């Protein structure tokens, strides 16, 4: 190790020149006023920069995940939307596997999921992309099982998604058949009400429901609407007869990317007085349960060699410290979104104060976090140490402006104490944040702003031997923090960290 | 919360 490094992650501290309701600017913050000058950077922590949809604010779990990982981890929605945009379903490994199984087997494949543009559990565009790719892959026979929404979309929008689907299958692809329509109340239960699931299950396997066809099914639904039965509660409609049922040896893909409401129906298929079809293989758009044998079209990012893992692999010990409210953020999320502790990794939990709301004690336990970090700097055992400072975010969420000011003052004090100890004991200090919050405490109306923001966050560096630079093709972002730490420490960067170091050694 | 990038990461805390 060339340089020992102390990384401070402030929680909810963004960079805003807009002074109204700006608890950071208006707080006495003389330490960060100095660290955020000269050689410092401002990096992105929201939206596509951290793998979230464009325009979406950051948060603690995304932010610590990206900081710790040294790469953008793409949230399911973005990841699948990119695959659609770039025509990547046709080479998706698991889709090719599902299609090869059908082509080498009985030729029959099924798609099943929530058919709307709600985007909470699914999107109709993803189902359309799947049909196009399955057609291109040469699957002989494809059936669709349409789960009516009415919850993430309006209760009488389903007939519009049904018209879109029928027209798409008939005239755009000329391939694939609608086999079932049933409300999400039945198909997508998550409360172990198996009498609800069974309605959808028997429709899919046994054709239990109202018989219809392409010419009549929209009118069936309109009659349901007129009887005050809306999308979420549609009782089953059965098309194509027995051909369209899930039968022995069939293959099925569920295209929802939200696991909680897919666990029951997918388990019923993959593991009532009807005979259960045998030798089914089930695929999910994403992982629904690690305990399931199902392949996923978009399995979890493997997240090999996040910073904590990599330091342990290089035989470098490390320290992670937070107070209670952010302890999961510097452990579970920082380490890649799982509960794993690495060889040589020491953890430190500072108790948060026992108060009804944190605006009552806005300094929370920042002083105690600083005390523990200073102790580690004095010992010098760990070449990498990091902490989180909770107050700006947690007091920010109360909406109380003057409390947020005091939170930022207490955080600045704590940062200065750590800074002075890094200079005495030979560590370089880098200060960053996981997203903004306290720089925007008031809405334009004067009312409270209790949410995260889309502002950039600081990245500071006390070592005078390096200069900040920008990436060639994009703004710097949280994915660049761990690469930059490793460069300052003189350590190698793993290939899996596709973020870049944004310093150059002088 | 079950895997990095699942739906709970859209809002977090
Ligand atoms: Na200030
Ligand atoms: Na705020
Ligand atoms: Zn946070
Ligand atoms: Zn927060």
Numbering used by the authors:
A (entry chain A): 27 to 297, 305 to 539
B (entry chain C): 1 to 13
From the reporting publication:
In all vertebrates, cofactor-dependent phosphoglycerate mutase (dPGM) is a 2, 3-bisphophoglycerate cofactor–utilizing homodimer consisting of 23-kDa subunits, while the parasitic enzyme is a 56-kDa monomer cofactor-independent enzyme consisting of a phosphatase domain connected by a flexible hinge to the phosphotransferase domain. In dPGM, an active site phosphohistidine (H10) equilibrates the phosphate between the 2 and 3 positions of glyceric acid, while in cofactor-independent phosphoglycerate mutase (iPGM), a transition metal ion–activated serine (S86) mediates the phosphate transfer. We previously discovered ipglycermide, a potent inhibitor of iPGM, from a large combinatorial cyclic peptide library. Our results show that the high-affinity binding of ipglycermide to iPGMs freezes these structurally dynamic enzymes into an inactive, stable complex.
